[PDB]
Amino acid sequence: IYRAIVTSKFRTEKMLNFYNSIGSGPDKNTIFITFGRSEPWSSNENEVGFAPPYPTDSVLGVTDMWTHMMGTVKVLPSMLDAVIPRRDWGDTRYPDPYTFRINDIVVCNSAPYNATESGAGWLVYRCLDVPDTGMCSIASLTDKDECLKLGGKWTPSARSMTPPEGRGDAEGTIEPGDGYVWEYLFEIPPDVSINRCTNEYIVVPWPEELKEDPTRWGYEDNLTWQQDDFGLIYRVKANTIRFKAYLDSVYFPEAALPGNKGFRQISIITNPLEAKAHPNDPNVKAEKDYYDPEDLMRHSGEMIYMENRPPIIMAMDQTEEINILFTF
Amino acid sequence: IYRAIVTSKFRTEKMLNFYNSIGSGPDKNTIFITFGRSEPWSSNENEVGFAPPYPTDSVLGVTDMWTHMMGTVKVLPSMLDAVIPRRDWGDTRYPDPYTFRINDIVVCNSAPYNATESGAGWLVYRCLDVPDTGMCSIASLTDKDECLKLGGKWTPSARSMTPPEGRGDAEGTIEPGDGYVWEYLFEIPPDVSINRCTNEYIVVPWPEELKEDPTRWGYEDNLTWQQDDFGLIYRVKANTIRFKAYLDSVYFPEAALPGNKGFRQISIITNPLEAKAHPNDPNVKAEKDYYDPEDLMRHSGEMIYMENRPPIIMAMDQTEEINILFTF
Ligand SMILES: [Br-]
Ligand SMILES: [Br-]
Ligand SMILES: [Br-]
Ligand SMILES: [Br-]
Ligand SMILES: [Br-]
Ligand SMILES: [Br-]
Ligand SMILES: [Br-]
Ligand SMILES: [Br-]
Ligand SMILES: [Br-]
Ligand SMILES: [Br-]
Ligand SMILES: [Br-]
Ligand SMILES: [Br-]
Ligand SMILES: [Br-]
Ligand SMILES: [Br-]
Ligand SMILES: [Br-]
Ligand SMILES: [Br-]
Ligand SMILES: [Br-]
Ligand SMILES: [Br-]
Ligand SMILES: [Br-]
Ligand SMILES: [Br-]
Ligand SMILES: [Br-]
Numbered sequence: 128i129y130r131a132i133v134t135s136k137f138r139t140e141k142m143l144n145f146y147n148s149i150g151s152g153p154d155k156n157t158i159f160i161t162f163g164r165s166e167p168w169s170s171n172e173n174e175v176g177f178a179p180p181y182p183t184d185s186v187l188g189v190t191d192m193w194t195h196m197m198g199t200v201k202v203l204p205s206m207l208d209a210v211i212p213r214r215d216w217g218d219t220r221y222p223d224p225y226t227f228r229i230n231d232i233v234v235c236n237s238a239p240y241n242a243t244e245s246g247a248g249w250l251v252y253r254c255l256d257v258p259d260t261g262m263c264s265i266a267s268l269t270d271k272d273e274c275l276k277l278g279g280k281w282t283p284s285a286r287s288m289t290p291p292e293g294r295g296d297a298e299g300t301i302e303p304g305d306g307y308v309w310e311y312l313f314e315i316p317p318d319v320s321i322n323r324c325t326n327e328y329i330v331v332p333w334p335e336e337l338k339e340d341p342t343r344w345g346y347e348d349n350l351t352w353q354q355d356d357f358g359l360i361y362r363v364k365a366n367t368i369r370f371k372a373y374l375d376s377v378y379f380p381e382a383a384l385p386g387n388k389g390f391r392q393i394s395i396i397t398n399p400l401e402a403k404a405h406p407n408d409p410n411v412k413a414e415k416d417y418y419d420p421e422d423l424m425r426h427s428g429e430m431i432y433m434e435n436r437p438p439i440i441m442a443m444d445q446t447e448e449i450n451i452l453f454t455f
Numbered sequence: 456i457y458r459a460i461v462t463s464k465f466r467t468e469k470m471l472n473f474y475n476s477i478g479s480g481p482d483k484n485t486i487f488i489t490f491g492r493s494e495p496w497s498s499n500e501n502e503v504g505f506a507p508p509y510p511t512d513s514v515l516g517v518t519d520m521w522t523h524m525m526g527t528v529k530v531l532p533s534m535l536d537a538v539i540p541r542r543d544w545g546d547t548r549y550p551d552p553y554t555f556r557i558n559d560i561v562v563c564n565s566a567p568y569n570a571t572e573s574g575a576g577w578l579v580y581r582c583l584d585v586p587d588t589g590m591c592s593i594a595s596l597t598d599k600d601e602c603l604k605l606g607g608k609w610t611p612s613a614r615s616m617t618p619p620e621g622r623g624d625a626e627g628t629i630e631p632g633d634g635y636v637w638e639y640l641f642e643i644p645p646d647v648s649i650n651r652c653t654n655e656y657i658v659v660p661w662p663e664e665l666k667e668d669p670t671r672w673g674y675e676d677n678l679t680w681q682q683d684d685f686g687l688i689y690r691v692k693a694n695t696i697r698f699k700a701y702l703d704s705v706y707f708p709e710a711a712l713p714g715n716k717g718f719r720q721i722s723i724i725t726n727p728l729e730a731k732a733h734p735n736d737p738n739v740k741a742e743k744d745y746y747d748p749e750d751l752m753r754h755s756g757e758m759i760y761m762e763n764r765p766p767i768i769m770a771m772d773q774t775e776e777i778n779i780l781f782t783f
């Protein structure tokens with residue numbers, strides 16, 4: 128008899144609680160990324176389009192993971208980035224380069240066809256309104272607000288004749304005139320773009336990092352903080368965390384030996400405990416940065432994510448980058 | 456390209472994130488439950504089978520929600536409960552009352568058909584093994600282990616003769632004889648099974664309260680604490696939280712008088728702010744236990760949940776139990 132819904136702001140909430148929960152202390156969580164394996168999938172595993180087996184969400188799956196674990200890397204917050212699907216205004220290398228949709232977060236000033244204010248990093252804007260005529264996804268209802276009395280995912284006809292520029296009005300509202308409307312959100316720093324961003328995704332700072340260094344993210348001229356309190360991740364429907372962990376082979380010389388067939392498994396384990404002598408002892412939370420699986424209480428903590436992929440070669444003191452996408 | 460996924464523990468992990476993120480300070484959350492709208496949805500709202508319209512997950516939705524907010528109550532941890540689907544052994548008022556599957560969580564000792572021990576609350580066992588002979592999701596798979604390794608859930612053709620009793624062996628194993636293995640999990644105190652549980656949901660203690668006082672949850676003999684660290688919610692794949700809160704008219708005189716209109720909207724705002732004298736005044740995260748909407752800065756916080764229902768009359772000195780489900 129009751130009609131309820133979890134609003135998308137809940138998807139962001141989860142993502143935030145998770146990111147905030149991480150910390151040192153018994154009151155906090157420590158997550159460890161893990162790698163391991165050697166037993167090659169099959170012969171034809173180095174082929175192109177080769178899909179290894181999915182990981183088995185089961186205790187046998189978990190143990191089959193812990194058995195092949197070769198080492199562990201503590202994941203700190205500075206390695207987690209709230210990210211959203213990247214969409215550059217006019218990138219014809221993908222679909223609909225000029226036609227968008229309401230609430231679509233579009234990036235600008237990242238390419239010659241984005242160039243709007245050199246010297247600044249990528250500027251990200253939100254699409255508030257679009258051109259009248261178009262399609263309402265479901266049913267029909269089309270005109271000035273025919274699909275705006277209910278507001279269903281609406282794809283317009285006419286295109287964006289031009290990228291929005293600057294930081295809009297006090298509320299970042301910009302009216303290009305092409306029948307579109309945008310809201311200036313923020314500015315991504317060069318290094319962040321270079322180091323953290325990708326072709327698929329961009330980074331959204333966290334409320335905290337935003338409140339501490341506003342100008343850094345082109346968030347200073349912003350007043351919507353008097354309302355959202357640095358809740359940008361909320362404003363752009365961010366609900367995805369992209370990791371960025373480097374495997375320091377310099378740590379372990381175990382597989383940094385010539386041959387090596389690399390590992391094919393990855394897993395994120397939360398709150399694993401340090402191997403105890405007398406099993407009837409007080410469990411200890413693992414808070415160091417690295418660990419030898421044997422130095423870790425097998426099965427301790429919770430395994431929230433397992434990954435299977437082709438083998439990855441590791442050298443002497445060669446640095447290997449690990450990235451994963453958690454969604455909420 | 457890669458073959459990876461999130462395991463069941465990830466969901467539990469999210470629920471725990473939510474529950475633990477609540478409190479004071481900036482890295483924690485203050486959740487309020489709002490109740491509002493006195494004006495009828497329509498003249499037929501009091502008619503049986505009447506459902507109002509689904510709320511709209513849009514800024515308009517929130518503005519509207521606020522437009523009609525009558526009051527808001529702070530949500531305390533003691534009000535949230537990790538709950539899992541409830542399946543009572545023997546409840547012949549439902550399907551498979553004697554036929555279970557692997558990993559099913561059954562409840563015994565919660566009614567005559569369950570009775571196993573006066574002097575103990577509900578005992579929640581987990582089905583570990585079942586009769587070899589039976590049927591399978593995919594017909595062409597007339598074999599346990601076959602259907603076991605092929606995915607499909609196996610349904611034993613031989614029913615469970617008697618309900619599992621006691622706490623079992625070392626890890627909690629129990630074998631009546633009907634070729635149905637069981638694993639005792641924990642127990643549920645009356646004060647909880649009576650106020651917290653429902654027909655389809657049984658409460659499961661959170662780690663800290665399982666720690667704070669074990670024997671209470673029949674988790675005393677337990678040894679898994681030497682590894683899972685009171686992570687019971689993980690073992691049962693608990694990802695749902697149930698809200699138990701009370702709306703006292705006494706604190707909202709306005710909204711109540713000998714003849715009011717009631718309230719038809721409930722929603723949840725995380726981290727709202729109190730009213731400001733002026734827009735630039737630093738943001739004052741609202742922590743009081745209850746607010747009149749006017750005392751809160753409109754649109755502050757993040758509305759992660761909305762819900763509309765027929766009117767609920769809020770007479771003088773009468774409290775209303777407001778329940779809310781959250782799935783992660
Ligand atoms: Br109902
Ligand atoms: Br830390
Ligand atoms: Br399992
Ligand atoms: Br597990
Ligand atoms: Br850090
Ligand atoms: Br286009
Ligand atoms: Br970096
Ligand atoms: Br933050
Ligand atoms: Br931060
Ligand atoms: Br150990
Ligand atoms: Br699940
Ligand atoms: Br947590
Ligand atoms: Br909206
Ligand atoms: Br909103
Ligand atoms: Br409490
Ligand atoms: Br049956
Ligand atoms: Br009965
Ligand atoms: Br109670
Ligand atoms: Br807890
Ligand atoms: Br607790
Ligand atoms: Br205000």
